[PDB]
Symmetry: C3
Subunit: 125 residues, 3 copies
């Protein structure tokens, strides 16, 4: 069993002591991503703009991990407000169309930096 | 290779996701809520709702060539922490001799305003 | 595929029908740990004191599962109050310095026994 951390510059710097992803053999566990740009600026706009940045962050981490969106196995979504469900789902369906990972989604009390959502994922190398 | 699982006996997915996704020997199941396979919200007690949730999970496991006794980890999201004990007493009917690792938290809200969401990870037969 | 439940005597007794950990071949899934002593008493004190007990519980479960902190793959943190983020992170950083697992952290509405945090993890066996 080999453990290989992943840290990529095209994703926001970790807000605490964690790698962007950790590979255990061929399985990749990705850290939760929030709507922050690679240069660490909070995303402004709509829920669509925010979700778009979150998935781009995930996409970039997957690339640095020798994986891709098409190789995502499971995704967990945490929303700051359950009413943002449909708007998030729309951007989500844009990236997961032909390939549909398993998924869970819940509305939590609050997220780091007061953001609207956090998304984590597990993918195959 | 990643193998998607579509379960005809489970409620239709609320977003762009498969009921489960298999990667090698592991199965990642999507979050299930107290909704009948005819896609109607379960009305009644926490025990009644818990029963439907686990039944949906059981059905998905069967469709993924797995079973309750092969579940490795379960994550429970409650809409109200006070439902903990009652939920636990129904949960014990399905996981008694076989006890998966588990986590349980109470979140702010869940899709469709339901009282709980359960996801899991299992080993293929 | 071999599934091996792990019973950790030095961790708080399971609050429901679950194992402290479950090993599936070389991967280990750990149950959510809360700030309770091995003697089932709820830790009283600072966020740091609670964070220390949760990480020690996780440490003991890792040991019982033939693993270690430096073999942790992913950690998920659930806080009862997002404002405890910084204090929790400070303690967390002590145990995950050279080795930094993937991680997620969210604040939820409430946790079992009314505690302030719950930590689960996935680790690799030695």
């Amino acid at each position: 069993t080999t453990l290989t951390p992943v840290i990529c510059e095209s994703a926001p710097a970790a807000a605490a002591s964690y790698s962007h992803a950790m590979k255990v053999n061929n399985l990749i566990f990705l850290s939760g991503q929030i709507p922050v740009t690679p240069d660490n600026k909070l995303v402004e706009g709509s829920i669509a703009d925010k979700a778009e940045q979150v998935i781009q962050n995930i996409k970039n981490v997957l690339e640095a991990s020798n994986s891709s969106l098409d190789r995502v196995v499971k995704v967990n979504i945490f929303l700051a407000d359950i009413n943002h469900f449909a708007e998030f789902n729309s951007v989500y369906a844009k990236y997961f169309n032909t390939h549909k990972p398993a998924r869970s989604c819940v509305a939590v009390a609050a997220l780091p930096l007061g953001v609207d959502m956090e998304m984590e994922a597990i993918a195959a190398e």
